[PDB]
Structure 1
Amino acid sequence: DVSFRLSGADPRSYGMFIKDLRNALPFREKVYNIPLLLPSVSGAGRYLLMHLFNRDGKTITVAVDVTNVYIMGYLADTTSYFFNEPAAELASQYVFRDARRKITLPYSGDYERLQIAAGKPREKIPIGLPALDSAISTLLHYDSTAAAGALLVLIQTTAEAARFKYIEQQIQERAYRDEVPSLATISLENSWSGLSKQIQLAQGNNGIFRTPIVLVDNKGNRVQITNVTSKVVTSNIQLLLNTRNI
C-alpha cells in the first residue's frame, strides 16, 4: 500500500508519495515510454490501498482501482463509504470487509456528479496540501455534501497528480497555500482518456494522432496536440488508460 503523512510534508515527500503511487500500478507494456495500465485485473489485486494521514495523525484508507486509478471508496475507522456505482459495489466485495458498517454515498465518483453534490465546480475549489489535510479531516466524519467537496480535492491531489507530472508540480507549489487549479490542469484532467487513446492509436501510425486533442493548457485558450513528440506526451502524461476501458 502507499502511505502519505501531511505532518511535516514538503514538496519533496509528496513527490515521493506520488512516485510510490505510480510505482504501485501494474502494467505490462510501455507505449511511447509511458506505462500502459492493464485492461483488467481480478481478485482483490485490482485494488490499491492508500493510507492518508492528516496533520494530527488521523488516517483514512482510500482504495484505488489499479486499472484506471479511480477512487472506489474509503474507510474511516469502522465505517466504509463506497461510491454509488457498480464497480464500487464490486470493490466492496474485496476491500474493507471488516468495517462494522458500510455506507453508500448518494453519488457516483465522477467529476460531474461530485460537483453537483458539492455546490461548486472544480475551478472554484482550492487544492494544495493544506486542502488535502482538510479533506482527510472532513472524510473522517460523514457529511455527504462535505465529502463531495473533499473528494474533489482528494482525487485531484492524488490520482490526477499520478497521471500528469504537471499537476504533481501544481500541488507541490501549493504545499503551504491552496489555490484553485489552472485551466491547464482542468483540461488535462478532462483529456486523460482521450490522450490515452490517441497515444495508443499512434503506434503503427508513425506517432501521429488520428484525431488531435485540443487542450486549453498553457496556451491560454486553445492548443492542439497532433503527434507524440509534443511534450504533454514526452514530458507530462505519466500513465495510459488501456483502450479496452475507453
Structure 2
Amino acid sequence: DVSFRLSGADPSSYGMFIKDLRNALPHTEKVYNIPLLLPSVSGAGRYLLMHLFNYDGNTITVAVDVTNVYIMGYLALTTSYFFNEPAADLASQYVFRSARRKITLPYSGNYERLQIAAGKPREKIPIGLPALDTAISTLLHYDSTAAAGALLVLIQTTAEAARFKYIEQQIQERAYRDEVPSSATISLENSWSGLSKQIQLAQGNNGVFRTPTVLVDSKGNRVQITNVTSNVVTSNIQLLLNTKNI
C-alpha cells in the first residue's frame, strides 16, 4: 500500500505519496476526466492502509475507505483506534485484527465533531509536513483530545490533498513550515461532496451544474462554480465521491 516517510521528506516525495494514494483508490469510470470512486466495495478490499513514518521512524498505519477517502481508524504499535461510528466499527472487522487491544475514540470522525473534541476550528490548526510529523507522534501515544487535533491535520495532509491538487500544493508550500489553511482550502474541503455531485449531474446537462457551488478563492472572494470549464473542475479536483453515496 502507500508509504510516506517524513525523514527526508521534501515537496517532491510528498507529491509522490499523494499520487500513490490517488492511484491506490479504484475506479472504473471517469467523469469529465476525473476518476469516479466506486459506489461501494465489499471485504478488506474496501480499505486502503497507509504507512506513515514520523521523522524518527516510528510508524502508524491508517485505514482509508476507498470509496470516499475517509479515515476510519489507525493502528499504533499493538493498539488500534476507530471512530465512534457504525462505518468505522464495521471497518474494524477487516483491519488491525492482530492488534493486541482495540480502542474506540469517544467521537465520530467528521471534521465538525473532531473540531469540538480538539477544542478548536481547523482555521486555527497549522498544517504542513512538520504538523503531519507531529500528528503522527501524537497518535502513537493515546490522548483523545490531542488525537482529535492530530486527525484533523492528518486528514488535511492526506485525504484532502488527494481530493484536490490545490491542497496538495498548499501542503507542499508548508513542507518546512506549518501554516493554518487558507479559507479557500477550507471552502474546498467542505465543497467536495457537492462538487462531486454537481460534476456528475452535468453529464446530462451540457456540463452545466443543476445547482452552482459556492467557494472562496485564494483571497477571501466568494465565487460561484456554475459549469465544468472552471479550473476547480479542469485542474483542481482529482477524485469524485460517487453520487451513489450522497
Q: Same fold (TM over 0.5)?
A: yes
- Kindly provide the CA deviation profile for residues 123-170 of structure 1, in whole angstroms up to 9, marking residues without a partner as x: 000000000000000000000000000001000000000000000000
Counterpart of 1:109 in 2: which secondary structure? coil
Match of 1:227 in 2: 227
- Kindly provide the CA deviation profile for residues 106-139 of structure 1, in whole angstroms up to 9, marking residues without a partner as x: 0000011000000010000000000000000000
Q: CA–CA distance in 2 between the matches of 1:129 and 1:221?
A: 27
Counterpart of 1:81 in 2: which secondary structure? strand
Instruction: Tell which deviates more after alignment, 211-220 or 97-106.
Output: 211-220
1:219 positional shift:
5.1
- Kindly provide the CA deviation profile for residues 49-77 of structure 1, in whole angstroms up to 9, marking residues without a partner as x: 00000000000000000000000000001
Q: CA–CA distance in 2 between the matches of 1:219 and 1:227?
A: 21
Q: CA–CA distance in 1 between the matches of 2:166 and 2:142?
A: 32
In angstroms, what is the RMSD of aligned CA positions? 0.5
Q: CA–CA distance in 1 between the matches of 2:220 and 2:175?
A: 24
Q: CA–CA distance in 2 between the matches of 1:126 and 1:220?
A: 18
Q: CA–CA distance in 2 between the matches of 1:9 and 1:190?
A: 28
Match of 2:82 in 1: 82
1:218 positional shift:
2.5
Aligned residues: 246
1:196 positional shift:
0.3
Counterpart of 2:189 in 1: which secondary structure? helix
Counterpart of 1:48 in 2: which secondary structure? strand
1:222 positional shift:
0.7
1:217 positional shift:
2.3
Question: Is the 1:37–1:68 Cα contact (8 Å) retained in structure 2?
Answer: yes
Q: CA–CA distance in 1 between the matches of 2:152 and 2:132?
A: 10
1:216 positional shift:
1.0
Q: CA–CA distance in 2 between the matches of 1:151 and 1:208?
A: 35
Question: Is the 1:129–1:177 Cα contact (8 Å) retained in structure 2?
Answer: yes
- Kindly provide the CA deviation profile for residues 19-48 of structure 1, in whole angstroms up to 9, marking residues without a partner as x: 000000000100000000000010100000
1:94 positional shift:
0.3
Counterpart of 1:95 in 2: which secondary structure? coil
1:90 positional shift:
0.3
Q: CA–CA distance in 2 between the matches of 1:149 and 1:57?
A: 21
Q: CA–CA distance in 1 between the matches of 2:139 and 2:219?
A: 36
Question: Is the 1:216–1:223 Cα contact (8 Å) retained in structure 2?
Answer: yes
Match of 1:156 in 2: 156
1:221 positional shift:
2.4
Match of 1:27 in 2: 27
Question: Is the 1:52–1:59 Cα contact (8 Å) retained in structure 2?
Answer: yes
Q: CA–CA distance in 2 between the matches of 1:193 and 1:135?
A: 26
Query: What TM-score, normalized by structure 2, do the two folds share?
Result: 0.99
1:204 positional shift:
1.2
Match of 1:165 in 2: 165
Q: CA–CA distance in 1 between the matches of 2:135 and 2:210?
A: 40
Question: Is the 1:188–1:217 Cα contact (8 Å) retained in structure 2?
Answer: no
Q: CA–CA distance in 2 between the matches of 1:41 and 1:111?
A: 24
Q: CA–CA distance in 2 between the matches of 1:200 and 1:219?
A: 28
Which structure 2 segments of 5+ residues have no match? none
Q: CA–CA distance in 1 between the matches of 2:204 and 2:40?
A: 24
Query: What TM-score, normalized by structure 1, do the two folds share?
Result: 0.99
Q: CA–CA distance in 1 between the matches of 2:111 and 2:21?
A: 21
1:220 positional shift:
2.0
Question: Is the 1:22–1:162 Cα contact (8 Å) retained in structure 2?
Answer: yes
Question: Is the 1:74–1:81 Cα contact (8 Å) retained in structure 2?
Answer: yes
